[PDB]
Design a protein around this ligand. Structure first.
Ligand SMILES: COC1=C(OC)C(=O)C(C/C=C(\C)CC/C=C(\C)CC/C=C(\C)CC/C=C(/C)CC/C=C(\C)CC/C=C(\C)CC/C=C(\C)CC/C=C(/C)CCC=C(C)C)=C(C)C1=O
Ligand code: SF4
Lengths: 40, 88, 92, 64, 58, 62, 157, 138, 324, 96
C-alpha cells in the first residue's frame, strides 16, 4: 500500500511534509469547509 | 504643462535606448541595458497616460510589463553566459 | 497624502552629510554559474512578492475568486520550483 | 473608457464615453453624432479649453 | 543580583531608543502644536488645508 | 464623514461660483474687440458641466 | 604660554587614557607560551575586563604579543607582520624563549630573542609566565603608555 | 523645478549608460536611471510602482546584471494668475478614498485574471530557460 | 517646515550611540554567559569602554592608499550607512513618534532592505583581492536568498492587518500580538533576520574571508568601521521589526489598567532590547553554519514553509470571513 | 458662536446625522442630478442654515461639555477611539 512509502517520505523530509500538510489544510478549508458553512 | 514634459522625457529615453542598441554590434551587454531602458520608457508612458486619463488599464498593463522585462533580462543573461563560455 | 516623502528626502540628504563628516574626521587630523542561478531564483520569487502585495491588501474586497486565482498562480510557480528542486540548481 | 478610476470611484471621462457608445450603438452612420465623439476626445485632453485660455493670454500679450 | 551589569548597556540602548521617539515627538508638537495623525488620506489633508485657510481668514 | 460634507460642499460651491463670476467678468472685460466671442460657454457639446480643467496632472497629492 | 599648558596637559591625559583603556593586542603565540596566554584570556584572569581583546589581523591591532620560540624560518614572517601595524605599535615579549634565546638559545634554527627582529618594549619572563605574570606585564605596558606627552613634545618641537 | 532637475539627471545617467567605458560603471549608472525614474513616479502620485521599481529593477535586475558583470570579465501656457484659485474640489469621493494598492488589487486578480496567469506562465518560462541552458553541473 | 533637520539629528545621533552601547552589550553578555565579567575596569561598569574605543580608533594612522579608482571604495560605506539609516524613517515608535507616515511603509522597508546588497558587493569588488571580493559576493547571495523568506513572512503579516501602514499594523494588535498564532512564523522571521545580516550561526561566508586572507587589502583605519556601524544599525532595525509585527509595537504585554504610569515608548524599547539579547544569546549558544548547507537550508526549509504559511493564513481567514 | 472649522463639524457630525437628515438628502439628490454649483446653490443654503442653527443650539445647551470635546478632537486630529472621554461627557448632557 501507499502508507509505507508515504511514511518513509515523511520520515526523510520533515520540512516538505510539514509544508504540504499546512498548505493542504489552507487549501481544504476554503474548498470544503467554506461551502458547508455558507449554507449554514 | 507637465504631460508634455513627461512624454518628451520618456520619448528621449526611448530613442536613447534605440541609440545604445544600434551603435555597438558587439558589446551584447549594453544592448540588454538599452532594451531595459526602452521597456522603462514605455512603462512610464503607460503610467503617465493612466494618471492623466484617470483610467486604470494603464497601471495594470504597466505592472504586467515588469514580468516580461524580468524574464527577458534573465534569459538574456543566461544566453550571454552560455556564449561567453565558448571564448575565454 | 504623499507629502510624507519630503521628510525621507531631507533625512537622506542629512544622512549623507553625516556620513561625509564621519569619513572626514581622520582627514582633518573565476566564474560560477550557481551565483547566476540564485540570482534568477531571487528575481522570480521577488516578482511573486510584488504580485502578492496588492493581493493581501485588497483580499477582503474579493472573495473566493481572487483567492483562487492567486492560488493558481502559486500552483504554477510551485510546479516551477518543484522542477527547480529535482533538477538540482538549488543545493551547493 | 474602461471606467475604472485611479482614486477608486470612476473614470471622469467614462460617462461621456458611454453616451458616445450608446449613440453609436444605434447609428449606422458615424457623422450623425460625431459631437459626442468630439466631447469624449476633448474630455480626455481638454484641448479646446486650453486653446481658449491660450487665446485669452494672447489677448493679454498683444497689449504690449 | 549579579547579572545587572550585563543589563546596564541594554538599559542604556533602550533609554536612548525611547528618547529617539520622544525627541521628534516633542519637536513636532512644539511647532505644529499637535501630534502627527496615524492616517493621512486625501480627505484628512483636504480638511487640514481648509482648516488652515479658515483659521487664517478668522 | 457622509453627514458632514453637504455644508462643506455648499461652501466650496459658494467659493467656486464667486471665483467663476469674477473670472467671467474678467474675461468679458478683456475681450471687447474681435467680434464672435461668446464670453463663457460650455465647451462640452452635450451641455454637461465639468470643473475647469488645469494643466496639472494629479494635483490632489501634493 | 602657561595658560594653554593646562589645555595641553588635559589633552595629553585624555589621549593616554584613551590609548590605555582600550588595547587590542595581536596574538602571535606559536609555542607553549600561547597556551598560558590563552588561559590569561580565559574566564579566570579575564583580559576583557581591562579592555584587552585579541585581534585576528595586524591591521587593526594596537600591540603585538610574541609568545613562543622564534625560529629562523618564522622571523621574516614576524618582521613582515610587525611592519603592517599602525603608529603606536608596542611589542610585548612573553616567555623566556621570546625575550632572548630561551631554553635552547644554542641552535642552528633559533633566533636568540625577538628583540633582534622587532623593537620590544616590555619583557615578560617566565617559562611559561603565569597568567598573573602576563597581566602584570600588560599593566606595566599601560603604565609605560601613561608616560607619553606626545602632544607636549609636538608643541615644544 | 523638482521635476526638471530630476529628469535632467536621469537623462544624463541614461546617456552615460550607453557610452560607458567599462560595464561596471555602465551598470552603476543603469541603477541611477531607475532611482531617478522611481523618484519621478513618486512625484507623479503612484507610490506603489515607485517602490516596485526599487524592488524589481534595482532590487533584482540590477543585482543580476552586476553579478554577471563581476564575473565573465496643446500645453497650457505658464500664465497661472487666475488658475490656482479656480480649483473645484468635489468632496464626495474623498471619503473612503482607496490607495494605489487597493484599487489595483481590486481588479488585477478578479476581472483581468487571465493576463495575471499569463504573466505567471512567462515567469515559469524564464525559470525553466535559466536552468536548461546553464546547468553544467560538472 | 524647518523643523525636519532637528528630528533627523534626534533620530541619527542616539542611533550611533546605541550602536556603540550595543557592541558593549554584546561583549558584556557574551562574558556573562561564559562566567566572566567583560569590560569592567574602564568607566564604572564598562560604560566608558566604547568611548575609549572610539578615541583610540581616531588616534591612529589611516591606511588609505585604496589601490584603486579612489571613488568606489569610499562610496560603499556611505551607501550602506545611508540605507541602514533611511530604513529608520518609517518606524512608528509610539503614536506620533514617527518621522515619516508612509501609507505603504512596508513594501518600502522591503525595498530598502533589498537595496542594501550593493554596498558589500562594490566593497568586495573595489577591494582588489581574489578572495575578499568572492566572500563579499557569497554574503550578498546569502542576503538576497533570505530576502524572499523575509518578504513572504511580511505578506503573512500583511494579510491579517489588511493595510501596509506600519502604525496601523500595531493598531490592529489590540486584541492579540499576532505572535501567539504566528509563533512558527515569528521563529521563521527571527531566523531570516538573523541570517540576512551575517550575525548568526549563519555567518561563515565572511568568517572564512578573513581566515584565509587576513584582510591584507586596503583597510582604512575607521573608514571600514562604517560597514560595522551599518551592520549593527541593521541589527537594531531588524530587532525592532519583530516587535513591530509579531509582538505589540508599543502596547502593554499582559496588563490590567494598573501599570499605566509608564508610556508606550518604553514598551517598544524593552521588547527591542529583549530581541537584541536573544540575538547575542543565539550567537553565543550555537556553532557556525557552513555555506554549503547555508544556501540549501535557506532555499529548501524556509521558502516552501513560508509559502505554506501564507497559503494557510489566507485560506483560514477567507473560510470564516475574518478578513479586515 | 463657534466657527464651522474642521474640529467642531467632525465632533458634532453625530448630532448633524440625525437632525439634518432631510436637508442633507435633498442636497445630495440635487447634486446627483446635476453637478452645477449654480443649480445646487439654493439647496446649498438650507443645509448651511440648519447646520448653523444646530451648532448654535448645541453651543447654548451643552456649553462646557462641547468646548473640551472640540479641543481634544483638534488635539488628536479627529480620532474618536483615542480619548472618547469628553465624547461621552458630551452626549451625557446633549441627549441626541
Ligand atoms: C569588528 O571589530 C571591531 C570592534 O569589535 C567588535 C569594535 O569594538 C570597534 C569600535 C567601534 C566603536 C566603539 C563605535 C563607537 C563610535 C562612536 C561612539 C563615535 C561615533 C558616534 C557619534 C559621533 C555619535 C555621538 C552622539 C551621541 C552619542 C548623541 C549625544 C546625545 C571597531 C571599529 C571594529 O572594527
Ligand atoms: S619560554 Fe618556556 S614555555 Fe615559553 S615558548 Fe619558551 S620553552 Fe616554551
Amino acid at each position: 500500500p501507499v502508507m509505507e512509502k508515504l511514511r518513509m517520505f515523511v520520515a526523510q523530509e520533515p520540512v516538505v511534509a510539514a509544508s504540504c500538510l499546512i498548505g493542504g489544510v489552507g487549501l481544504f478549508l476554503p474548498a470544503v469547509v467554506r461551502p458547508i458553512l455558507d449554507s449554514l | 504643462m507637465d504631460l508634455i514634459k513627461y512624454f518628451t522625457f520618456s520619448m528621449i529615453i526611448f530613442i536613447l535606448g534605440i541609440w545604445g542598441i544600434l551603435l555597438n554590434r558587439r558589446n551584447i551587454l549594453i544592448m540588454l541595458m538599452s532594451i531595459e531602458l526602452m521597456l522603462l520608457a514605455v512603462n512610464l508612458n503607460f503610467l503617465v497616460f493612466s494618471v492623466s486619463l484617470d483610467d486604470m488599464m494603464g497601471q495594470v498593463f504597466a505592472l504586467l510589463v515588469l514580468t516580461v522585462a524580468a524574464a527577458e533580462s534573465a534569459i538574456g543573461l543566461a544566453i550571454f553566459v552560455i556564449t561567453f563560455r565558448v571564448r575565454g | 497624502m504623499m507629502l510624507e516623502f519630503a521628510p525621507i528626502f531631507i533625512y537622506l540628504v542629512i544622512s549623507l552629510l553625516v556620513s561625509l563628516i564621519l569619513l572626514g574626521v581622520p582627514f582633518l587630523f573565476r566564474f560560477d554559474i550557481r551565483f547566476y542561478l540564485v540570482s534568477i531564483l531571487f528575481l522570480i520569487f521577488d516578482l511573486e512578492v510584488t504580485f502578492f502585495f496588492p493581493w493581501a491588501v485588497s483580499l477582503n474586497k474579493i472573495d473566493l475568486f481572487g483567492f483562487w486565482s492567486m492560488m493558481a498562480f502559486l500552483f504554477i510557480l510551485t510546479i516551477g520550483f518543484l522542477y527547480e528542486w529535482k533538477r538540482g540548481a538549488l543545493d551547493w | 473608457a474602461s471606467g475604472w478610476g485611479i482614486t477608486g470611484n470612476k473614470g471622469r471621462c467614462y460617462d461621456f464615453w458611454m453616451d458616445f457608445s450608446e449613440c453609436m450603438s444605434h447609428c449606422r452612420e458615424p457623422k450623425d453624432c460625431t459631437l459626442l465623439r468630439e466631447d469624449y476626445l476633448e474630455c480626455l485632453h481638454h484641448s479646446k479649453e486650453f486653446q481658449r485660455r491660450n487665446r485669452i493670454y494672447k489677448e493679454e500679450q498683444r497689449k504690449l | 543580583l549579579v547579572w545587572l551589569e550585563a543589563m546596564l548597556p541594554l538599559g542604556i540602548i533602550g533609554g536612548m531608543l525611547c528618547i529617539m521617539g520622544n525627541s521628534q515627538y516633542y519637536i513636532h508638537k512644539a511647532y505644529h502644536g499637535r501630534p502627527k495623525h496615524i492616517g493621512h488620506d486625501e480627505w484628512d489633508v483636504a480638511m487640514e488645508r481648509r482648516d488652515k485657510k479658515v483659521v487664517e481668514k478668522a | 464623514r457622509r453627514t458632514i460634507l453637504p455644508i462643506l460642499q455648499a461652501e466650496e460651491d459658494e467659493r467656486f461660483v464667486s471665483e467663476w463670476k469674477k473670472y467671467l467678468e474678467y474675461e468679458a472685460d478683456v475681450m471687447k474687440d474681435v467680434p464672435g466671442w461668446k464670453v463663457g460657454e460650455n465647451v462640452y457639446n452635450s451641455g454637461r458641466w465639468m470643473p475647469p480643467a488645469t494643466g496639472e496632472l494629479r494635483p490632489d497629492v501634493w | 604660554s602657561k595658560a594653554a599648558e593646562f589645555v595641553i596637559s588635559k589633552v595629553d591625559d585624555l589621549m593616554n587614557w584613551a590609548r590605555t583603556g582600550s588595547i587590542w593586542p595581536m596574538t602571535f603565540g606559536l609555542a607553549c607560551c600561547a597556551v598560558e596566554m590563552m588561559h590569561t584570556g580565559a574566564a579566570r584572569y579575564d583580559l576583557d575586563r581591562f579592555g584587552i581583546i585579541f585581534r585576528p589581523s595586524p591591521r587593526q591591532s594596537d600591540c603585538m604579543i610574541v609568545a613562543g620560540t622564534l625560529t629562523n624560518k618564522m622571523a621574516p614572517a614576524l618582521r613582515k607582520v610587525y611592519d603592517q601595524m599602525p603608529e603606536p605599535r608596542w611589542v610585548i615579549s612573553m616567555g623566556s624563549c621570546a625575550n632572548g634565546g630561551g631554553y635552547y638559545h644554542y641552535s642552528y634554527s633559533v633566533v636568540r630573542g625577538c628583540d633582534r627582529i622587532v623593537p620590544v618594549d616590555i619583557y615578560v619572563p617566565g617559562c611559561p609566565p603565569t597568567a598573573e605574570a602576563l597581566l602584570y606585564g600588560l599593566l606595566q605596558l599601560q603604565k609605560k603608555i601613561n608616560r607619553r606627552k606626545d602632544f607636549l613634545h609636538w608643541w615644544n618641537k | 523645478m523638482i521635476l526638471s532637475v530630476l529628469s535632467s539627471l536621469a537623462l544624463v545617467s541614461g546617456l552615460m549608460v550607453v557610452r560607458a567605458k567599462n560595464p561596471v560603471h555602465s551598470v552603476l549608472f543603469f541603477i541611477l536611471v531607475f532611482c531617478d525614474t522611481s523618484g519621478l513616479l513618486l512625484l507623479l502620485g503612484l507610490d506603489f510602482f515607485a517602490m516596485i521599481f526599487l524592488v524589481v529593477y534595482i532590487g533584482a535586475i540590477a543585482v543580476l546584471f552586476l553579478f554577471v558583470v563581476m564575473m565573465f570579465h496643446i500645453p497650457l501656457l505658464p500664465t497661472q494668475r487666475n488658475t490656482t484659485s479656480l480649483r473645484y474640489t468635489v468632496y464626495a469621493g474623498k471619503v473612503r478614498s482607496w490607495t494605489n494598492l487597493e484599487t489595483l488589487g481590486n481588479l488585477l486578480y478578479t476581472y483581468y485574471f487571465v493576463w495575471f496567469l499569463v504573466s505567471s506562465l512567462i515567469l515559469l518560462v524564464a525559470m525553466i530557460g535559466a536552468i536548461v541552458l546553464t546547468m553544467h553541473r560538472t | 517646515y524647518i523643523a525636519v533637520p532637528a528630528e533627523i539629528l534626534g533620530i541619527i545621533l542616539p542611533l550611533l550611540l546605541g550602536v556603540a552601547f550595543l557592541v558593549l552589550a554584546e561583549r558584556k553578555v557574551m562574558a556573562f554567559v561564559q562566567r566572566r565579567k567583560g569590560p569592567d575596569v574602564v568607566g564604572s561598569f564598562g560604560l566608558l569602554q566604547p568611548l575609549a574605543d572610539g578615541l583610540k580608533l581616531i588616534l591612529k594612522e589611516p591606511i588609505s592608499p585604496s589601490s584603486a579608482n579612489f571613488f568606489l571604495f569610499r562610496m560603499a560605506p556611505v551607501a550602506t550607512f545611508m540605507l541602514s539609516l533611511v530604513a529608520w524613517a518609517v518606524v512608528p515608535f509610539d503614536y506620533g513618534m514617527v518621522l515619516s507616515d508612509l501609507n505603504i511603509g512596508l513594501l518600502y522597508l522591503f525595498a530598502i532592505s533589498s537595496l542594501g546588497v550593493y554596498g558589500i558587493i562594490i566593497a568586495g569588488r573595489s577591494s582588489n583581492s581574489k578572495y575578499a571580493f568572492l566572500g563579499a559576493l557569497r554574503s550578498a547571495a546569502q542576503m538576497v536568498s533570505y530576502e524572499v523568506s523575509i518578504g513572504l513572512i511580511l505578506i503573512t503579516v500583511l494579510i491579517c492587518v489588511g493595510s501596509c501602514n506600519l502604525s496601523e499594523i500595531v493598531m490592529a494588535q489590540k486584541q492579540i500580538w499576532f505572535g501567539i498564532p504566528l509563533f512558527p512564523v515569528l521563529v521563521m522571521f527571527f531566523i531570516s533576520c538573523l541570517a540576512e545580516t551575517n550575525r548568526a550561526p549563519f555567518d561563515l561566508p565572511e568568517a572564512e574571508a578573513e581566515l584565509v586572507a587576513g584582510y591584507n587589502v586596503e583597510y582604512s583605519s575607521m573608514g571600514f568601521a562604517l560597514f560595522f556601524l551599518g551592520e549593527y544599525a541593521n541589527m537594531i532595525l531588524m530587532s525592532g521589526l519583530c516587535t513591530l509585527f509579531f509582538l505589540g509595537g508599543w502596547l502593554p504585554i499582559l496588563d490590567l489598567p494598573i501599570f499605566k504610569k509608564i508610556p508606550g515608548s518604553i514598551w517598544f524599547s524593552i521588547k527591542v532590547l529583549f530581541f537584541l539579547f536573544l540575538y547575542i544569546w543565539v550567537r553565543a549558544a550555537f556553532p557556525r553554519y557552513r555555506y554549503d548547507q547555508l544556501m540549501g537550508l535557506g532555499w529548501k526549509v524556509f521558502l516552501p514553509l513560508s509559502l505554506a504559511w501564507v497559503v494557510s493564513v489566507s485560506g483560514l481567514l477567507v473560510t470564516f470571513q475574518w478578513l479586515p | 458662536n463657534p466657527i464651522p472649522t474642521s474640529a467642531v463639524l467632525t465632533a458634532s457630525a453625530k448630532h448633524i446625522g440625525m437632525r439634518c437628515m432631510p436637508e442633507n438628502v435633498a442636497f445630495l439628490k440635487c447634486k446627483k442630478n446635476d453637478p452645477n454649483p449654480e443649480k445646487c446653490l439654493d439647496k446649498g443654503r438650507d443645509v448651511t442654515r440648519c447646520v448653523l442653527g444646530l451648532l448654535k443650539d448645541l453651543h447654548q445647551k451643552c456649553q462646557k461639555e462641547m468646548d473640551d470635546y472640540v479641543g481634544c478632537m483638534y488635539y488628536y486630529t479627529n480620532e474618536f477611539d483615542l480619548c472618547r472621554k469628553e465624547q461621552e461627557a458630551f452626549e451625557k448632557v446633549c441627549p441626541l
